[model samples]
Target: TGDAKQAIRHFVDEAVKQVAHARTPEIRQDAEFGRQVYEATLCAIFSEAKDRFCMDPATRAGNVRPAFIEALGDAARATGLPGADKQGVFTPSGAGTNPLYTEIRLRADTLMGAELAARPEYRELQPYARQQAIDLVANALPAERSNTLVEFRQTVQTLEATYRRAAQDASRDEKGATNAADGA
Candidate 1:
């Protein structure tokens, strides 16, 4: 669990750096842009993380969701961004007004909905999933801007590869330790 938290932090840092690098000078000059990227990137990473680590509905709702929310709050404070210091910035209520947050959530939810729809086990649930996807898009307001969307996608791919390699290494180490214990 600690390992996963560390990985999440590392991922967040890398994402922030990549988005910063990818920004055009105009967007970079906008003081508010960093906060927007931070919020959007966090949402994007959390969406994927939820699916990767918390596929079980109960675990997703109870544990992983809160953990990710806590991590997001920690990351936001670590940024020392002025906006992050404002009250409720890390809350869902606060995020509701953010266009980037909405955009990322919409994209993630749509993809997940499609995935659920394709699964044979979820055949009976397809109608609800499809309706959710339809409603998500139909109600979404267009994002005001997205200067770093492409960069974020690239960054997420890199982060996913890094995380997978780390997990494999950790599993190998654990197995080796178990064998050594048996020998002892």
Candidate 2:
């Protein structure tokens, strides 16, 4: 448990440092570059949180939604991003205004589909597990921040395709390992 927490913090720290290091005079002045960096930050946060949640039984069953929301705020504040301290600045909602929320939910659904397909016994847990994954990312993005929200759409779309393929590959690899073990 301690190790997982430390690992999550380590990732957050590295992400912050990377963002700061990339903010050169020229890059800092470019609004597009700033958006890209923010988008990457959000991805890193979601990726790390998801991995941690999946690996830890305690977090998987606990209140990870609020914890993840707090991590988003923490990362935002750590990066000194604008409106970092504002309440709900990084909170995502199911409301129609936030497309990213829907995208993240769909991405999680795809991932869960792959995982459940690999191990059907866990199919009963699909909806709950899928929502956990979605909440981690969907609720992390700022609901009202148009700048980040607009940029995140393309980034999330790209990630959806990438993650879908990766999930399928992982599923195959996992089954192969199981089959090999069973044969032996």
Candidate 3:
């Protein structure tokens, strides 16, 4: 039915999917400070949601956070991270990320799943998507999934593009609505 909790749950579950597919490297690592990933991913998601639901422009700012590695990619280019991590012109290929980032990503994934599962509102649909997220994240992020990020890079782009597409579709629906009696 229509439950805010369910929605939040679905959202949390989806957030994990997006992040795993998005490639924040917070998945499948037994590292310290995993909380960092959780924080960044949580904020990044709110940012994306704002971009999709809010009537403001600043909502897009979330893309710069750890939840979205593209920000890191840009940072690397800007010489934010030293050495090979630099996607900078000097090393355009982009270097391997650090363990810290991986830990953060994993925490984000776990938290996303937990948040959704605990929501009573969105609980109905939460099961399906929540389960989906669990299965995907578990299998996809396992240490055996892929030895390197380069191989899974396209999946990240695809996932992000799909997310943006969802927002675009929603926007189109909103703009196309028949406002026969327009009013405030």
Candidate 4:
């Protein structure tokens, strides 16, 4: 038990030294090591936004893009964007190389702002998510996102409409069954 505890403490001490190096590169003799540690830390933070905004195990991965747009759409509404209620569609016409900005763009500012206000996960994950904030600003990734934003929006809209139609049909079927039972 003592051995295991010492091993774990050593691991933490190594991490601390690296972070301290991040804070004070001049103090750390190995300057490049500290910079690499800083870089590794950034990659991890970038992964947060990627993980949150990209992949969804529950749905087709293709659907994740619009889902992110939708998530941002909700947050934008909560935090007050002008027209959050509508599908903020931008039709490309007479276009040169254009930046197809989403109707409700998920900037690092909004995501981290909401997280800090609503879901700060202490020192552990908070820094990572916050780094995601910077990654978003620096990365400007949504601009270079998959070419399926429009398609995803349409597909999701259609799916919702179809779902509503099916529910109505089911309600009608249930009502007919009830009437038949009452007569019998």
| Clashes per candidate, residues 3 or more apart or on different chains | 0, 0, 12, 0
lDDT of 2 by residue, 1-184 (tens): 3332233333333433433343434343554544443444454444434453445333443435345445444544444444422364653221222223333444444534443434433322322322332333333345544434333433333343344345556567766677688867
Candidate 2 structure lDDT: 0.40
Query: What is the Cα-based lDDT of residue 93 in candidate 3?
Result: 33
Q: Model 2 TM-score?
A: 0.26
Q: Largest TM-score belongs to which candidate? A: 1
On a 0 to 100 scale, what is the lDDT of residue 37 in model 4? 31
Better of 3 and 4 by TM-score: 4
TM-score, predicted candidate 4 vs. hidden true structure: 0.24
Q: Using Cα atoms with residue i matched to residue i, what is each candidate's TM-score against the true structure?
A: 0.32, 0.26, 0.23, 0.24
Q: 80-100, model 4: which lDDT tens digit per residue?
A: 222313345421121211111
The 0-to-1 C-alpha lDDT of every candidate, in the order given, reads 0.40, 0.40, 0.38, 0.34
lDDT of 3 by residue, 49-143 (tens): 32332332222544222343453344233322223433443322322223233343345446555545345443123233424333443343444
How do the residues 1-184 of candidate 1 rate in per-residue lDDT, one tens digit apiece?
3342233334333433433344434353665555455554445443544355345433445434455445544543443323333364453323322433344334434434443434434312222222222222222223322323333333434443454445556567766677788867
Show model 2 residue runs off by greater than 4 Å.
1-22, 59-184
Q: Which stretches of candidate 1 lie over 4 Å from their true place?
A: 1-45, 50-83, 86-147, 176-181
* Candidates 1 and 2 compared by TM-score, better number: 1
What lDDT is reached at residue 104 by model 3?
A: 38
Candidate RMSDs in Å, in order, are 13.8, 16.3, 13.9, 16.3
